[PDB]
Symmetry: D2
């Protein structure tokens, strides 16, 4: 136990009224994507990147529920802490809210409703996580880049501009909801002004690194799935996508107890205890099977 | 001493740990089925039976959230009351919990995780609602009767036995989660002894009515969909099913605002106000279109 | 000189290049919807109307394949004939191609890519089939009327105009792909002039009947599913929709063997033989179960 | 044009009666998976492995249809040839049928109903394709390894046995439907005897390489999708899986014209011509867009 290198933040704050009435009772990032709470996925992304000290930011109403779901992290070899965003005034506000949590360390922000799947994903993040200066982002080809921060490249494949929700996007490349930053991000976030939309823009954070030549924009290839959670239709597809992978394989995607176990943050003895409450359903069954099966 | 309509109950309590970890932060009946919380579907079903006075039974933990979503019903021409079920002791327990709520009235119990769709469904509920003594249930042909209460019929089509979760079902006709009762149900329920599963069984209730010759079983035809919400798989399918119908039709299934509007429990002016806070999203836009479209 | 029942047509011709490359090797109406060829669904629809004598219209290239699948109908208590449509010149062309087949009889046209599901669907088809003069069509509320023939109603609910693919639909009520005709349709069809699209339009046919006051439009309610097969997306959804119903119920939608059995066009002994060559798979096992289960 | 290094074979032969009636009219590998014929996927796998000379083996009935779909290959920079398997007497029969096509060259067999997706898939195949001696296979963790050829590993992660459809599988690792072989496979196939099931087993081919220490079994990781096409349910999931990837990305999976174009087997001028017939639908639109868009 802990009373209060790279730190993680999950920004799991309010989506406004766009998925109401589904999200009227509870924020989106506590709803299941197939067999597990949405937040398990970005949590799992951070743990895959090797990050164990992690701040979860949510609305004032829902922190108790996040706190309840995940606890202090210790049962999974994590050190979790919690903070609140009172209004949805931009994703960069994560760096103001998390300022004292970050301290003097390196950091990474993941959106709490972002789903990543694919091969060698541990290596793709460990590469960004090892770059100790500047920021690292990921660009992914999408059909509807107007909804996102859009990267423009020159003919030699070098990032030359970023634009948030452009009316005429410059490419089909969109910045995904996963960001790695050095010790400069907090101080860049403090200097931000609200945009025409009344938000502290993460795209402004990232343009400040671009303007200094310190932004690494790596291509996240078509062979990776960055799954859309923005619409009722896209939530549905995501659960369909995860279910098809888990049913085919008899292996789970973004099972935090398993990831902990593979990183050796918990031992056999602890995994076994975590299997015990859930032993009557499939998820406890999965976790027990992992004790005696070799999975390459 | 000397003496001189039908209330509804929705049971939306603990699904224990069945669907953990998806349901760890929030109870099943608030998870979305496509674009609206699951509890809207059975609420709509009672509304369609003509029932305006309704008791929602939930866990102590989740009652506030049902209340936040649903309020007192006044916005939709209903009256909603709340009660808690501290321990999931079985479905027949709704009648003890709801004894003061029911009083000397007729009742209807609906499971808070049961979705229905189909044609003349209003009329099928009308005929059970207007049967003023005894009980009515609905029998539906399912692939896996062993999971349900099962009705055995004789060669005349008459109901002759009921068995809860039989290993060797006598038919494929499962009893759906919607039950209509006369003034005898509370007394029947008080006398029940817990099953060996540690549960007060709705099927024991229906058997009492059967043994007194006061149980109408109606067939809910194959042209109706009675959807499965028991697993992560079936839940996903339930969302796909609704999405497909609403995207095809430009009409919603189980939109409580709409149903109150068509029942004339609320007027055009009242519906316009309900639309306003959701005007940016599709749900609010749909409520608005209903004002100026004849829909047959 | 001196003179003294209803045939069906299924149009399963060229979808041109719309769904190429999926449909390059094989026509649309033979692609599966879940577990059975698409053409089974509209065939089943005619069977449900009581119609036993049926002409299948396909491309010259694909007729052998319809014939290999369906034969002459004798196995299922029907009589199937075949005709070809060398150029996709429009739906009303079915009446010229099928003129000798129809003779002096009543008719019914069904599109070979149109799926229907719902309750009392038998009865809804019964009332159109038994209307012996004029034409009957069905109007269904859709999200995208602009893609269909659209019915405009006056405030009494009476059909007053029909428009093919209007840019500004007068209602959301599209005319479904199922049409019932008296002995005037062939003559109406011979007189049509091609539309500017180079097509003989079914909607022109229905307008002739409207202008003579002999067009019944019945509403196919929202409790019916009329499924979309026009796109790769909608097709996939159509398979998901059927799969969900059949997996839930342990019953099939549009199983022609079953429907002949229940119509008493074939007997138990005949159905047992049809089951045999499919006995290893689920379809054959289902046919076998139908012999020894009462299904209401 | 060509009249009749590594060669490819696609075995797209009969699945018997297990998907009847869906497959009664046409073999499975000509049915669409979402927007394209199933065979496009394994074709695309071979082209991704750098293989351009390719033999397509099908039933006698369906060769004309495969021939019709794909032609001589020349429009896509391939050299296709066709041959027939008269009865389904085992996957190893591909090497007897293809003996003279193979000649003295290296070879690779892909099953015509196998779908692969994932990142760095070009590199994973180019590694197997470069190993000039022995055979290379892939092992993938699945839920139901009894259906497949199953690999057993020792504690150091070395393949020590292969078993075809074991009643008690030794691991959850299954051999996928993609095989690379040197000049020995033809002569090993000729010496095979039929199994207890009356088939020339590909697993026997691969055990012969294992017994000689010449089988490379590489793990295909959980971050890759090997999609199941064996059941109606699994076909459906696959089309759902592909559609979700293509709709999110605005990029296609296994578009052979695109792969050809990226390998430089056809130029801009040719791609443009292939866009022309399909210009009115999305797939022609996709191909034209590829002329003027840089996709990393
Ligand atoms: C399918 N993936 C996955 C894995 N690859 N792994 C393997 C794993 C686990 C711990 C450390 C490295 C690796 Br590789 C795992 O244990 N769980 C997984 O869900 S993943 O890398 O694409 C992924 C991990 C976490 C969140 C989202 C996807
Ligand atoms: C699709 N259905 C439906 C309707 N039929 N209706 C029409 C309606 C509304 C009020 C009273 C009668 C009728 Br009919 C509606 O307004 N909303 C609906 O969702 S239903 O009858 O099958 C249904 C009602 C309530 C919950 C689930 C399905
Ligand atoms: C689900 N339906 C259905 C049925 N209702 N029936 C029952 C049936 C059969 C023959 C005659 C009347 C009736 Br009811 C059946 O045997 N197979 C069916 O698929 S349906 O009436 O909506 C339908 C029939 C034909 C094609 C598509 C749907
Ligand atoms: C999504 N994939 C994919 C690609 N990766 N590519 C990129 C590509 C194309 C040609 C040569 C190398 C690469 Br990388 C492509 O052009 N089409 C694709 O479908 S894939 O490598 O996983 C794949 C290719 C072919 C069949 C099945 C999957
Ligand atoms: Cl990639
Ligand atoms: Cl019915
Ligand atoms: Cl209806
Ligand atoms: Cl992997």
């Amino acid at each position: 136990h802990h009373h209060h290198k790279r730190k993680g933040i999950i920004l799991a704050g309010g989506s406004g009224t766009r998925l109401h009435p589904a999200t009227l009772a509870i924020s989106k990032q506590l709803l299941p994507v197939y067999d597990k709470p949405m937040i398990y996925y970005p949590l799992s992304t951070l743990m895959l990147a090797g990050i164990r000290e992690i701040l979860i930011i949510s609305t004032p109403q829902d922190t108790p529920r996040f706190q309840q779901l995940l606890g202090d992290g210790s049962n999974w070899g994590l050190d979790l802490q919690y903070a609140v965003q009172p209004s949805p005034d931009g994703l960069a506000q994560a760096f103001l809210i998390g300022e004292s949590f970050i301290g003097n360390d390196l950091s990474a922000l993941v959106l709490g409703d972002n789903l990543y799947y694919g091969h060698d994903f541990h290596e793709l993040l460990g590469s960004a996580s090892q770059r100790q200066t500047g920021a690292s982002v990921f660009a992914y080809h999408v059909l509807d880049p107007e909804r996102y921060g859009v990267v423009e490249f020159d003919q030699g494949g070098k990032a030359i501009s970023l634009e948030e929700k452009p009316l005429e996007p410059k490419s089909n490349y969109a910045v995904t909801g996963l960001y790695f930053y050095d010790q400069q991000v907090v101080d860049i976030a403090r200097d931000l002004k609200p945009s025409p939309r009344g938000e502290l823009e993460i795209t402004d954070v990232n343009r400040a690194y671009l303007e200094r030549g310190q932004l690494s924009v790596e291509i996240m290839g078509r062979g990776y799935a960055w799954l859309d959670t923005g619409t009722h239709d896209s939530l549905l597809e995501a659960g369909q996508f995860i279910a098809t992978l888990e049913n085919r394989q008899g292996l789970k995607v973004a099972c935090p107890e398993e990831i902990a176990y593979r990183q050796k943050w918990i031992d056999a003895a602890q995994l076994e205890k975590l299997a015990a409450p859930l032993a009557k359903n499939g998820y406890g069954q999965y976790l027990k099977r992992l004790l005696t099966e070799t999975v390459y």
